[PDB]
Each structure stands twice: as C-alpha cells, then as structure tokens.
Design a protein around this ligand. Sequence first.
Ligand SMILES: *[C@@H]1O[C@H](CO)[C@@H](O[C@@H]2O[C@H](CO)[C@@H](O[C@@H]3O[C@H](CO[C@H]4O[C@H](CO)[C@@H](O)[C@H](O[C@H]5O[C@H](CO)[C@@H](O)[C@H](O)[C@@H]5O)[C@@H]4O)[C@@H](O)[C@H](O[C@H]4O[C@H](CO)[C@@H](O)[C@H](O)[C@@H]4O)[C@@H]3O)[C@H](O)[C@H]2NC(C)=O)[C@H](O)[C@H]1NC(C)=O
Ligand SMILES: *[C@@H]1O[C@H](CO)[C@@H](O[C@@H]2O[C@H](CO)[C@@H](O)[C@H](O)[C@H]2NC(C)=O)[C@H](O[C@@H]2O[C@@H](C)[C@@H](O)[C@@H](O)[C@@H]2O)[C@H]1NC(C)=O
Ligand SMILES: *[C@@H]1O[C@H](CO[C@@H]2O[C@@H](C)[C@@H](O)[C@@H](O)[C@@H]2O)[C@@H](O[C@@H]2O[C@H](CO)[C@@H](O)[C@H](O)[C@H]2NC(C)=O)[C@H](O)[C@H]1NC(C)=O
Ligand code: NAG
Ligand code: NAG
Ligand code: CA
Ligand code: CA
Ligand code: CA
Lengths: 14, 610
Amino acid sequence: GCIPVITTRGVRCK
Amino acid sequence: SEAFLLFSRRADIRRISLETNNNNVAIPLTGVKEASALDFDVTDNRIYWTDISLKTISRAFMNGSALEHVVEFGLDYPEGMAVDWLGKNLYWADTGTNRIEVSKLDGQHRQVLVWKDLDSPRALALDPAEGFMYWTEWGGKPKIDRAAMDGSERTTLVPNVGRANGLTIDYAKRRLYWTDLDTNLIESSNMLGLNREVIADDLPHPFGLTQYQDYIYWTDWSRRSIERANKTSGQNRTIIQGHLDYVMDILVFHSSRQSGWNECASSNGHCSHLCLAVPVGGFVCGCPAHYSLNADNRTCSAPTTFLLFSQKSAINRMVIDEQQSPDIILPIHSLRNVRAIDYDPLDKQLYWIDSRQNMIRKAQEDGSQGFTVVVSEIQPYDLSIDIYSRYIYWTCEATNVINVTRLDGRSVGVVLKGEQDRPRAIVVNPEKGYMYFTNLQERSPKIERAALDGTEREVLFFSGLSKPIALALDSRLGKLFWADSDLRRIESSDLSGANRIVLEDSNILQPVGLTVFENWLYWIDKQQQMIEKIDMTGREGRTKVQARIAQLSDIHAVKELNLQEYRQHPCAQDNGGCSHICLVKGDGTTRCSCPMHLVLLQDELSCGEP
Ligand SMILES: *[C@@H]1O[C@H](CO)[C@@H](O[C@@H]2O[C@H](CO)[C@@H](O[C@@H]3O[C@H](CO[C@H]4O[C@H](CO)[C@@H](O)[C@H](O[C@H]5O[C@H](CO)[C@@H](O)[C@H](O)[C@@H]5O)[C@@H]4O)[C@@H](O)[C@H](O[C@H]4O[C@H](CO)[C@@H](O)[C@H](O)[C@@H]4O)[C@@H]3O)[C@H](O)[C@H]2NC(C)=O)[C@H](O)[C@H]1NC(C)=O
Ligand SMILES: *[C@@H]1O[C@H](CO)[C@@H](O[C@@H]2O[C@H](CO)[C@@H](O)[C@H](O)[C@H]2NC(C)=O)[C@H](O[C@@H]2O[C@@H](C)[C@@H](O)[C@@H](O)[C@@H]2O)[C@H]1NC(C)=O
Ligand SMILES: *[C@@H]1O[C@H](CO[C@@H]2O[C@@H](C)[C@@H](O)[C@@H](O)[C@@H]2O)[C@@H](O[C@@H]2O[C@H](CO)[C@@H](O)[C@H](O)[C@H]2NC(C)=O)[C@H](O)[C@H]1NC(C)=O
Ligand SMILES: *[C@@H]1O[C@H](CO)[C@@H](O)[C@H](O)[C@H]1NC(C)=O
Ligand SMILES: *[C@@H]1O[C@H](CO)[C@@H](O)[C@H](O)[C@H]1NC(C)=O
Ligand SMILES: [Ca+2]
Ligand SMILES: [Ca+2]
Ligand SMILES: [Ca+2]
C-alpha cells in the first residue's frame, strides 16, 4: 500500500 | 461558536472538540479518497478540503450536507488551500502545476495569480484584512514567499529555510508560524520574516501546524500524534490524540481565526467577478483567467482572440499577451478522445470530434450547453466550420465521404463520395467558395481542392507527401498550409497550388496539427509534446510556445470576428436565399447548389429530389 513520502516537490504516494 | 479541531487523515475529515473532553466525530463525507488540506468559512460553517488523489477541491457543511466539488479540472497536487472569508474567495496552490490560483468559494471565475518562477508552492496562509498572502515553496531552493492577495509584488520573506509546512498566521500577535520538515523545527517570525525564533526543537517529525489562543497545535508523523504547546515558550505541552498516523492537516474551527474587515466584505468592491485584497488601496477588481478588466476597473471582458489546443481528454485555451498569461484547461465534461476541434466566432461556441463516441459535440467554453451535432456507421475524422453559412464540413472515415451538417444538427448532405477516395483533413474557404482536403489513398496521398458543393475537384499535390494529416489556410494571404506527420515537415502554397515551399522540416518529431494566427503559424508536435510557432514574415525566429504537453491532438487559433466584415459575406444573410449550399464565385456573386442527393430547382435557390 501507499505511504506518504516527502519529496523535493511535495507529498507523494510511494 | 464552540472551538473545534479538524484534522484530515486517510479518506476522512474528523473533529475534536477543543472545549469539551467528550467529542470525537467524523464529518459525514462521501466519495473522498485522500483528504489533504483543510479550511472553512466562518460565514456559513462550510468546510473546504482538497483531494490529492481525486485531484479536486470540495466543500460541504460539517453535518455532511451539500457536498459539492468546486474545483475539478487542472489540478495535479493541490496541497495548499485557504478560504478568503472577507472577499469570499478560494485560494489554492498546486505543486504539480506550480500554480497559485483563485476563484469564488463556489469555484466560479477561476483565475491564476502566481505561475512564473514558482517551484512547488505548498502551504498557503491568507491575511485579507491586510491584503497579503504567504506561502512556502519547496524544490531546489525552498523559501517562504509573500505577495498581495492579487498575486502582485511577490517577494521572498524567509530565504534560509528547509521545506516549510503548516504556514499559519497568529492574527492577534502578528506572527508567522511554520514547521520545517528538513530541520525538524517549529519556527516563528513576525509578518516580515524577522525576529525568527525556534519554538520547539525536540520534535522528531513535525508536519502540520495551526494556532489557537496561546497554543500552537502540530502533528508529528513519527509520533502519530496531534499535540499542543504554548506558542511563546513551547512548554505546557499536551497530547490531544495519539495513534493517528499521517495526519495531512489540522485546522482550528473558530471565529477568532477569521475576523477583521476589508472593502470586499462590505461591497465586494462592486467588482463584477473578483474582489481581491491588496495592501495599499485595500482592493483591486479581478477577472477570470484570460479575461480583461475594463476601463471602469469593475467589469470584465472575455478574450475574443485566443489559441485553442486539444489533447486526448482535454481542450485548452491560451492567449498571446505580454504578461505571458498561462494556459488553462476548459471545464468541459465527458471528453474521452478529442481528435479535432473548431470554434464558431459568431455564437462563441466550441466544437470538437470525440472519436470514442464517434460524434461532433459542441459546448461553450465553460462547458455549458453541451450539444451533439452529429451522432451514430459514423466515424468523424476531421471538421471545419463554414462560419457564414453556419455549416460544418466534416470527413467520415467509415463511409469515406465529406458530409455537411448545420451547427444545430440538421443534415445538409454529402458533397463528396468516391470509391477510392479517403478524405481525411479538411479546411473550408467560404470567402472564395472552395474547400481543401487530404486524400489518404494508400500509396498515393493527395492534397485536393473542390468547390463547397463537390464540383471543380482538382488534385493540387500528389508528390512529396506521405501522411498529410493537418490542413490550415488563410484567405487574406491566399495561402494553404499542411503538416506531414511521416515526412515530419510543414509546407505551404498558394491556394491556387503555385509556390509550394517547405516552411519547416528540422527538429520536428510528429506534427499532427497546425493553425495560423495573423503572421504566425503554430503547430503541435505530439511525440515531442510541444507547441511551436514560426513567424511567416521571417522577422522573428522559431519559438517554443509550450512543452511537456502529452497526448496532443489538435490546435486552432481564433481571431475576434469583425461583424461588419462578417455580414458583408453574401452567404451570411439567409444563406443567400439558398436552401442548402450557398457559393461564392469570382464575380463575388452568390449561386446556390445542392448536396449530391438533391438537384437544384428552376427557382435557382432550392434543392429537390431526383
Ligand atoms: C506561555 O508562555 C509565555 C512565556 O513564558 C507566558 O507569558 C509570560 O507570562 C509570565 C507570567 O504571567 C509573564 O511574566 C510577567 O511579566 C510582567 C510584565 O513583563 C513585561 O516584560 C516581559 C519581559 O520582557 C515581557 O515579555 C512582557 O510582555 C508581555 O506583556 C506585554 C504587555 O501587554 C504584551 O504586550 C506582550 O505581548 C507580553 O504578553 C511584559 O512587557 C511582569 O510585570 C509580571 O510580574 C508580575 O507577576 C509576578 C509573578 O506573578 C509578581 O511577582 C509581580 O509583583 C508582578 O505582579 C510577570 O513577571 C511574562 O511577561 C509573559 N511573557 C510573554 C512573552 O508574554 C504565557 O503566560 C504562557 N501561556 C500560558 C501559561 O497559558
Ligand atoms: C480605472 O483605473 C485606472 C488605473 O490606471 C484609472 O486610469 C487612470 O486615470 C487617471 C486619472 O485619474 C489618468 O491620469 C491615467 O492616465 C489613467 N491610467 C492609465 C490610463 O493607465 C481610471 O481612473 C479614471 O480616469 C478617468 C478616465 C476618469 O474616468 C476618472 O473618473 C477615473 O478615476 C480608473 N477608472 C475608474 C475608477 O472608473
Ligand atoms: C505553563 O507553563 C508555565 C511554565 O512552567 C514552568 O516552566 C517549565 C519549564 C516547567 O519547568 C514548569 O514546571 C514550570 O512551572 C507555567 O508558569 C509557571 O508556573 C509556576 C508555578 O507557580 C511558576 O512558579 C513560574 O514562575 C511560572 N513561569 C512563568 C514563566 O510564568 C504556567 O502555570 C503553565 N500554565 C498552565 C495553565 O499550567
Ligand atoms: C445541515 O446543515 C445545514 C446548514 O445549516 C442545514 O440546512 C441542514 O438542515 C442540516 N442538517 C441536514 C440533515 O442537512
Ligand atoms: C451525412 O450525415 C447525415 C447526418 O449528419 C447522415 O444522416 C447521412 O447518412 C450522412 N451521409 C453519409 C454518411 O454518407
Ligand atoms: Ca493551517
Ligand atoms: Ca481543420
Ligand atoms: Ca487545426
């Protein structure tokens, strides 16, 4: 399942 | 007027009472997949939330009634959003589109406020009583930015900061708060970004933030908590709730967070469309995207001269101005496979072929008045509107005919049929009484001309073609244009077929459409995913217009119709008295003709059966 990930451009499912 | 804490988690928006110990309840929402960003309107107790997965913004009352989608199109990652409770406006930020937009709280009059040099705008806070908005920018060089609530005088407030979230204003004390997801701090400053203070440095993963009274509230993703502490000292800590992993946002539902006044609150500034708070002067009047503010600074005017380009499931509009206004998606529903578009400048209506439905549809730019002009062995391939006689000339891939239908759907008839004919692309020239089309016969592609009744049919070009799939023309210059998707080039010639010349054949991957705007020729490169233009005068160079546009399908320029010039056409007045087809001859006079299944009567105006 997805877990939110903080990226350089925002929060993304990964 | 009880104080409530609202938090978003997974697909729910849940409620914690800040005054009564005995209160945890979920807001009764339907159809939400990922509740992210929260705000509310103190005026009517409506709550607003964005959906990262649905790519929508929505609103409802706290009791779950009047669920409404206010923003549906043009969102990728709407991670920021805030209600302007004085001007009754909805602001949001999208980190995918790199845009900060505004609209009325019901979604009307959508406009783009910040779009340039914007990298991942995420957390948005509004101060309509002062006319400033604040936001955090992520990306290569994260910063906290400030601007007026009309987008003007954008400036960087706090340059040395990591990715900041939960930007919150303490309105009573005039202080900004935020979490830093890189330094794992909760910081505070004044409205100018000075007097910076670390409020809490011992938190392992602070993400969300808000402020109420003398306390700040945060969420910790490592501690799976909503916690609260003194906004000044950072002490007096208490855990509001635990075992809440991945809380996207927290919000204080209380009138103290939405107070004050501005000119928009008392009178909306009398603006027709948008009243936006500004620091000096109080307010300015705004307009929907691509509209013009009139000389009265109160009323707006829609664009009359623009560029339309379509994708498989979208039709976009852009203008050519010098503030470089951004392209927008038209809020048109039920688009499945748009393969060709046109526009009627008289009634200001958009037309397109959807080849998933095998229909010609028409709507207004707001998506209203959806009408099916052609429906079911019907396979429309391309279309071109005769704006004077109010007809669509369109090609049919199944029956291999050129069919004519009026804009209201009544069938005129077929003007071209043929055993080995494969008529695909088409442009009408009602000014001179001719049409131009491509004949994609296997092993012999052709570009052909005929009168608008099928007579006077001649092959203009039969060599140096592989897949001529797009056609454009300009009657004033007397020039015809086409793009060859296999030869990867764009050509032109006189409408007579003389002076064939290659306009562009370098660094083109797959041209699938083209259009003419005054002295500029635009085309779309589907494989290269860009729009390009060339100055046909040769003065200015080949310019990249926009890139990273997927599934490109068509492009079409619209110039404002000159009504005096329009009514000078003889076939614009009662079709010149003709029952079916009004034609222009070299004498400038009018003659009437018929579709292939009728014959002209001795009335020299009316068509009848054989
Ligand atoms: C959250 O945490 C904050 C910070 O710790 C708490 O606020 C502090 O509360 C204490 C206790 O009440 C205050 O101490 C008192 O201060 C007054 C006056 O202090 C002056 O100088 C301070 C130092 O620079 C300054 O911070 C003060 O500023 C406050 O007040 C002004 C005036 O309106 C206001 O504009 C500001 O925004 C600040 O709010 C102020 O200028 C001092 O006179 C007090 O002495 C009295 O009390 C003692 C003991 O009770 C008694 O012995 C004396 O005889 C006298 O009667 C006392 O020292 C401290 O100033 C506060 N600091 C701030 C920054 O506000 C807050 O209470 C916490 N919230 C909770 C617990 O909910
Ligand atoms: C709408 O806002 C405009 C802002 O530019 C005003 O135009 C400016 O008006 C000045 C006079 O106050 C004039 O000197 C400037 O040249 C002009 N600015 C431009 C053209 O960029 C305009 O103000 C009106 O000006 C005239 C036309 C009268 O109608 C006055 O009664 C107005 O104040 C604003 N129009 C409004 C508020 O109706
Ligand atoms: C909120 O906390 C303040 C501060 O608490 C003090 O400092 C902390 C670091 C911690 O060590 C606490 O145990 C301390 O008491 C409270 O204000 C203090 O109250 C005590 C109690 O008499 C007093 O001796 C101190 O002088 C106060 N300090 C200040 C700066 O005013 C305050 O009472 C707490 N609020 C509530 C509602 O409990
Ligand atoms: C919900 O709130 C609205 C707004 O006040 C109100 O009209 C309605 O009666 C309430 N109850 C239900 C069941 O919708
Ligand atoms: C032309 O279109 C009309 C409806 O627009 C249709 O009834 C007619 O059969 C078509 N002719 C063909 C496909 O040859
Ligand atoms: Ca907040
Ligand atoms: Ca066309
Ligand atoms: Ca076109």
